[PDB]
Enzyme design. Structure first.
Site, PDB file in Angstrom:
ATOM      1  N   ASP A 101     -25.533 -47.359  11.252  1.00 24.29           N
ATOM      2  CA  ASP A 101     -24.545 -46.741  10.451  1.00 24.29           C
ATOM      3  C   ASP A 101     -23.953 -46.084  11.483  1.00 24.29           C
ATOM      4  O   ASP A 101     -23.242 -44.724  10.694  1.00 24.29           O
ATOM      5  CB  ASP A 101     -24.981 -45.821   8.996  1.00 24.29           C
ATOM      6  CG  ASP A 101     -24.312 -45.426   8.275  1.00 24.29           C
ATOM      7  OD1 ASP A 101     -23.520 -46.277   7.803  1.00 24.29           O
ATOM      8  OD2 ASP A 101     -24.063 -43.554   8.459  1.00 24.29           O
ATOM      9  N   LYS A 153     -26.898 -27.368   3.417  1.00 22.76           N
ATOM     10  CA  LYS A 153     -25.918 -26.602   3.416  1.00 22.76           C
ATOM     11  C   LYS A 153     -25.733 -26.136   5.523  1.00 22.76           C
ATOM     12  O   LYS A 153     -27.069 -26.198   5.927  1.00 22.76           O
ATOM     13  CB  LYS A 153     -26.039 -25.112   2.797  1.00 22.76           C
ATOM     14  CG  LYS A 153     -24.457 -24.370   3.369  1.00 22.76           C
ATOM     15  CD  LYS A 153     -25.106 -23.070   1.605  1.00 22.76           C
ATOM     16  CE  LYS A 153     -23.479 -22.515   1.585  1.00 22.76           C
ATOM     17  NZ  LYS A 153     -24.166 -20.984   0.929  1.00 22.76           N
TER      18      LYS A 153
END
Ligand SMILES: C[C@H](c1ccccc1)N1C(=O)COc2ccc(-c3cnc4ccccn34)nc21
Ligand code: NI
Lengths: 327, 328
Positions: free
Chosen positions: B136, B27
């Protein structure tokens, strides 16, 4: 013997990595200092093949390496010697030879050329101040490190202990040779190196050699004639500076200390005129690095003794490597 | 202690504010440093859900944050850790994702694109110096701070501790992939990132992707062909720059160190050419900030000790946060 499981070979406190070049009497390997993580180059010299003159030469060449302490000259950090092999732990210049770089990427803008040529002039003048003249300049003497700083290699040494060795003795030097060679005049003074520096500066700003020969005969003719092409992009101040170096009469070439005042050399360095290098006194009481070394298991009296005598042993190497950028 | 029934809670010296996003195992919240008032982001990771190798991925990524110290890469300020939970206190990019900005406002003028792309190229080349290749690199790695400076997030990381679903990593990556992805060979070198940097450049100046399709076959076709539209407004220098990045043959793709010398990259920076980033030495001796911290109750000795070794504790965090722009 083996240091760690499934690891690379080692010598002393160094992990030996890829071979950079191999020669008759010497090999050079990239390596990593185990204690500090700093990257180094190690020259490996087989002593079993050397006669006494070769050995006594090798010894005094190593001593010259210890005497020369300049930001743009390959610096020695450690000596490791066995019965059969001498290992010389020194600065690693990751970007290779200058002339190879120029071939690959083309000429340097004059701003960048000025930056490297100030370094070259400072290093060679400092050698001349110490009465070390090379008289054998070639592309191999000029290297670049990972920050694109000039590192001069093998200045004042014989090529007996290079990777080119006795075999490649002549491949690279004729383009930098001063005309006195082919006139049959003396060839042992600093004037010779001054001419070679003029060739170097030409190659930096033009990407090419000023005297280019299809063979030895044509190269000689051009060197003796002394004429070279000024490219359309070269500044007048650069052209006038070359005139200080590429003078046929060695008596009329400028000394390096005079040329250090030149206009082009100092463009953009108005409050920073190039001057002969002054070695700073080495700080051997950095308590921060000393404490790190105690942590590595060396006693503070061992450290003080090694540094105060400047032994190029494993302690002074650690101390110097702790003063350089890591990884 | 508690902060009160109807107030935001705290962890260490931070008040926890609104949630920016949530993932399977992490989170991310906006937060306020109590002692300095500085805004930060906090990544909260529940360690009780992690197997030992996911734990090591987690700790690997922490190590990477500590290695990377660049002004256009999200910087770590503090680590708080319990048995169950890991809190990573880091920079907050208050203007959000570059992707969202481009969609909301359209393409950047080349002058504004240039300022960002200098930051991007500098950061990625710096990462490559540290032997960290991402492979990526995509829009989700690119954030903007309050001053519209680039901040790169998650470079070198897995997806384990990002926000979204497990199958969100694949959403944005194919249009940024190098053609080698689709040719059965290695896909691991710095050249892979270089190609993605060309796609990034194209999106900054055009507002859209150079290679797209409605499925993987169509996208592969376009990437392998290597052709892309030049908009009418794109300068010839920007077009020439794109040609250094988007080279099909990875062996012939330009290197970053040489690309930094490009005319477009340096327009308006003639005397200030882009160069490999040189990490400065951290100033740990700023007595103005040290004196402020003694006024907070820290002793001068503990400050000296925490700063001498990079601790990522309450003290070093406070010192660094005092060096950042105050809240306005
Ligand atoms: C980039 C993305 C993310 C998280 C939440 C919402 C949207 C994207 N992220 C992650 O997946 C996990 O790791 C992060 C660590 C820090 C930040 C961050 C710092 N400042 C801002 C400002 C806006 C948004 C995020 N951030 N973001 C991420
Ligand atoms: Ni051994």
């Amino acid at each position: 013997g083996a240091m760690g499981s499934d690891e690379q070979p080692h010598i002393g406190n160094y992990r030996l990595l890829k071979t950079l070049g191999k020669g008759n009497f010497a090999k050079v390997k990239r390596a990593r200092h185990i204690l500090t993580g700093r990257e180094v180059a190690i020259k490996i010299i087989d002593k079993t093949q050397l006669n006494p003159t070769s050995l006594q030469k090798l010894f005094r060449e190593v001593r010259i390496m210890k005497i020369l302490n300049h930001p743009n000259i390959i610096k020695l950090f450690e000596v490791i010697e066995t019965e059969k092999t001498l290992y010389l732990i020194m600065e690693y210049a990751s970007k290779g030879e200058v002339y190879d770089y120029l071939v690959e990427h083309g000429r340097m803008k004059e701003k960048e050329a000025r930056s490297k040529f100030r370094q070259i002039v400072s290093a060679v003048q400092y050698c001349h101040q110490k009465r070390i003249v090379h008289r054998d300049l070639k592309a191999e003497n000029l290297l670049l490190d990972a920050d694109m700083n000039i590192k001069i290699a093998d200045f004042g040494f014989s090529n007996e202990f290079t990777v080119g060795g006795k075999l490649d003795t002549f491949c690279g030097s004729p383009p930098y040779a001063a005309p006195e060679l082919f006139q049959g005049k003396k060839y042992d003074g600093p004037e010779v190196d001054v001419w070679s520096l003029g060739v170097i500066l030409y190659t930096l700003v033009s990407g090419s050699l000023p005297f280019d020969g299809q063979n030895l005969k044509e190269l000689r003719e051009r060197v003796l004639r002394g004429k070279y092409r000024i490219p359309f992009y070269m500044s007048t101040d650069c052209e006038n500076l070359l005139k200080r170096f590429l003078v046929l009469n060695p008596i009329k070439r400028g000394t390096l200390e005079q040329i250090m005042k030149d206009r082009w050399i100092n463009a953009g360095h108005e409050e920073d005129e190039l001057k002969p290098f002054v070695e700073p006194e080495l700080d051997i009481s950095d308590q921060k690095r000393i404490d790190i070394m105690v942590g590595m298991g060396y006693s503070q009296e061992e450290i003080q003794e090694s540094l105060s005598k400047m032994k190029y042993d494993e302690i002074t190497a650690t101390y110097l490597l702790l003063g350089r950028k890591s990884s």
